Structure formats: C-alpha cells, structure tokens
Write a protein that binds this ligand. Structure first.
Ligand SMILES: [Zn+2]
Ligand SMILES: [Zn+2]
Ligand SMILES: [Zn+2]
Ligand SMILES: [Zn+2]
Ligand SMILES: [Zn+2]
Ligand SMILES: [Zn+2]
Ligand SMILES: [Zn+2]
Ligand SMILES: [Zn+2]
Lengths: 143, 143
C-alpha cells in the first residue's frame, strides 16, 4: 500500500489536472513522488468510458501562481488564434498549458492538422508543444 | 497589496482550475481567503481574448484526492452520455465537476439545450448542476 500511504499529505503538495475530450484523458500537474503519478493514471484508466490516458504529470514541486496565470494566458492566446484559423475549428481541440508546455488534443483530419500546426508555431511563451491528435483520415487497422 | 501578500504560501494551500471554452472561462477550486478568489478572477479577466468569467472558486480547504477522482468519474460518465445523445453533441460543451458540482458550459441551440437537460438528469453522484449555456438562437440585443 505504498502508493496510498499518507495520500492526504502527498496530495496537499500536488496539483493534478484531469481533462477529458471525447474518451481520451490528459493528466498534467505536479506530484511529490512517482507512486502518486502512477496512482492517478491507474485510477483514471479504471473509469468507465475512458479509452486512452496521456500522463504528463511531473514529479516535483507544484508550480507557482504566476506560472498557472501565464499558462492560462497561453491557452487563451491559442484559442483566439484557433477561432480565427481558416480550416481548424476551435470546437474540435482541447487546449491546456502546464508549466509552459502547450498540449493540444482532439480528432482532426489532415487539412485541419496542417492548419493547427501552422497556428501553434505562432504562440508565444511556450517551451514545448505536445500534440495529441488522432487523424480521423487514418485507415482503421485490418481485423 | 493585501491580495498579493504571502501569495506563494496561500497558493500552496489552493486548487485553482482555469478552463476556457470559446472566449468564456470557468474558474473552480478552493482557496484560503476571498482575496485570492478575487485576484484569480481579476487576473483571468485581464487576459486578451477573454469575454466572460464564471468564478465558482470556493473559500475553504482543498478537496481530497478521492474527491477529485470521483469528480473526474462524474465528468467521464457525463461525456459518455453526451456522445450517445440524440441531439446535443459531445464536442459542443465543456464538462467539469468540482466537489460534486457538475458544470456544463458552451454554445447550443434550443433543441440541443433540451436534450442536454435530459442527459444531465441521468448523471449520478452530483449534488448540484450549474449550466452555463449561451443559447445561440436568442435574438441579439438591439443597437
Ligand atoms: Zn466524441
Ligand atoms: Zn503508463
Ligand atoms: Zn501519450
Ligand atoms: Zn486546462
Ligand atoms: Zn468559439
Ligand atoms: Zn465578480
Ligand atoms: Zn456566472
Ligand atoms: Zn475540468
């Protein structure tokens, strides 16, 4: 029961964001040990109707208030660029920024993905971009 | 500068979720004092491209780990019911559950809103539902 021991004290030191879009979950945030990072993934994967989980939680101290506000501003800037985009729609992707990493998740076609990649290069205050896009034009695997 | 004093210590005691959909922001979570709750709203409202902010942060202790996992499961259950719904689409609303309160936000027409209300009555483990829906069929105000 090591991953449950003193869970309350460890979670008080944590920030855990759980964001779902369709049946895919993005985990971001900060926890004090790898046991809690894995527990969060295990617990989310066990939820009904969850298909895939992307666990980008880090093991380390919680980020500062100014960081989450800067992160939110990056996300707001990205959403504004998306609703202005020619092809890709703002409704079709989830956008989250955690500690300067811009995450974009959703289901798009190839034309929409190319537009999205063009938009994301225009976002400031981003150290890394992680796209989690399922291309709906990909042929399904054979039986 | 009372709302900034010892901000780092106060934010360590906090959970602040900032979720945007189109140009509307939902704030949920827990902070130790009303000054931080108001500061979060002021800082989010100041971001470029933010039109409306719904501040549902509470002043109190951070919720437990088991609570955020139960909350996520409510959200996952709601998303599953939405993608099965006849009229309303899962892509058109943002769903978030915080401490047993189900928040649904987005832009819908009347038919989609009626379907949504039918779906939300079928979600368990919810003490309160807060819909933040803009009905796109509402006539715009006169000049
Ligand atoms: Zn879906
Ligand atoms: Zn894994
Ligand atoms: Zn992944
Ligand atoms: Zn987010
Ligand atoms: Zn929009
Ligand atoms: Zn206010
Ligand atoms: Zn409101
Ligand atoms: Zn949420």
């Amino acid at each position: 029961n090591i991953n449950l021991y003193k869970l309350d004290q460890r979670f008080k030191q944590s920030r855990i964001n759980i964001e779902s879009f369709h049946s895919t979950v993005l985990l971001t945030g900060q926890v004090p040990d790898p046991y809690l990072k894995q527990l969060a993934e295990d617990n989310v994967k066990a939820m009904s109707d969850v298909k895939a989980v992307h666990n980008y939680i880090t093991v380390g101290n919680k980020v500062s208030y100014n960081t989450i506000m800067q992160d939110a501003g990056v996300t707001a800037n990205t959403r504004a660029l998306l609703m202005k985009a020619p092809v890709v729609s703002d409704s079709k992707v989830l956008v989250h920024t955690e500690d300067g990493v811009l995450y974009v998740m959703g289901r798009l076609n190839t034309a929409e993905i190319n537009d999205l990649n063009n938009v994301l290069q225009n976002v400031g205050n981003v150290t890394k971009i992680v796209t989690l896009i399922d291309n709906i034009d990909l042929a399904p695997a054979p039986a």
